Design a protein around this nucleic acid. Structure first.
Ligand code: CL
Ligand code: MG
Ligand code: MG
Ligand code: NA
Length: 326
DNA sequence: CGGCATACG
DNA sequence: CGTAG
DNA sequence: GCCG
């Protein structure tokens, strides 16, 4: 088992679901406390289990696996022995975990804001609704739409959204293309937002495109919330039988020269991208982001025509999106 | 021990 | 500070 | 919390 998540296939569904879920609770709690290193280790250990070819049934099977030391191994041992891990259950039940989870799920609210509200005594969404003057316009939107944004998006919904985005993009710039990215591109049947990447085959033509796209979607009455720019974090009106619901949609524009890098980054998973960028820098001495891949010694950027190019540049076996579910 | 990804709005 | 993967 |  290789130590980096980008060196191994990780399917969406796997053989150690309960164990991985438990480790991800501890990772999430670590993030709520600002412990980014512990969050990363628990996330990585969880991801190792997702990559295994069969269920872990005994503690012995963890020996030699990367990112399993005394703490993560103890969690797995308790789950194997008793079906529950007392540490995990205490987190789940805790008022701090539950409230930080609720608050950070609000669009516009991060860990820092959630933690401040927690220390001020706030615990519920209606607590926040009762002092709306201390809310940003983005938080106001997130709170008004919170209930809809909590219900998953289906692949049917995505197809309908992609058609309306394509219509707007086509008027904004004929020839521009719309690619579904994010979790749906990794094979998810549901998601909590939809991600699209927009480019144009003629380099430079995409400059200034996103404002034109957003104006057209807004004129069509489809935009419930949004803020020169190249990423737009929107709330869209999605038709439903006899009504509609709010859906988070991210729109991103990239020049075609950067499109493989942007496609790679926006397809995720988050852990996969962090691991790929860590691998690039620490093992290959190259600097990776969603715009390109830089050689800091020759001071040159790699050209890529495909994601396959990027994996080859980094000396990694190619993984399709469905195997990037780290 | 230091390191832990790297952007944009 | 928020957002993204 | 774990790795190198
Ligand atoms: Cl930490
Ligand atoms: Mg997404
Ligand atoms: Mg998104
Ligand atoms: Na949030």
């Amino acid at each position: 088992m290789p130590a980096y998540a980008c060196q191994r296939p990780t399917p969406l569904t796997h053989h150690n679901t309960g164990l991985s879920e438990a480790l991800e609770i501890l990772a999430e709690a670590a993030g709520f406390e600002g412990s980014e290193g512990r969050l990363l280790t628990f996330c990585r250990a969880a991801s190792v289990l997702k990559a295994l070819p069969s269920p872990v049934t005994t503690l012995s099977q963890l020996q030699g696996l990367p990112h399993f030391g005394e703490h993560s191994s103890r969690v797995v041992q308790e789950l194997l022995e008793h079906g529950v891990c007392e540490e995990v259950e205490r987190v789940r039940r805790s008022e701090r975990y539950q409230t930080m989870k609720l608050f950070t799920q609000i669009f516009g609210v991060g860990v820092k804001t959630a933690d401040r509200w927690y220390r001020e005594g706030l615990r519920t969404l209606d607590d926040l609704r009762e002092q709306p003057q201390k809310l940003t316009q983005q938080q106001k939107a997130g709170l008004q739409h919170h209930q809809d944004l909590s219900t998953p998006v289906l692949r049917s919904d995505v197809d309908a959204l992609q058609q309306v985005v394509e219509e707007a993009v086509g008027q904004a710039l004929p020839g521009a293309t719309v690619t579904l990215t994010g979790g749906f591109r990794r094979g998810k049947l549901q998601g909590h937002d939809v991600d699209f990447l927009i480019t144009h085959p003629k380099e430079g033509q995409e400059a200034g495109l996103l404002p034109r796209v957003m104006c057209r979607l807004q004129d069509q009455g489809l935009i419930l919330y949004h803020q020169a720019f190249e990423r737009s974090f929107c709330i869209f009106r999605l038709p439903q039988p006899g009504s509609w619901k709010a859906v988070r949609v991210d729109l991103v524009v990239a020049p075609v020269s950067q499109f493989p890098f942007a496609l790679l980054g926006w397809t995720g998973s988050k852990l996969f991208q962090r691991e790929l960028r860590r691998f690039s820098r620490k093992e290959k001495g190259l600097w990776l982001n969603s715009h390109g891949l830089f050689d800091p010694e020759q001071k040159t950027f790699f050209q890529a025509a495909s994601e396959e190019d990027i994996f080859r540049h980094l000396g990694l076996e190619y993984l399709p999106p469905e195997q990037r579910n780290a």
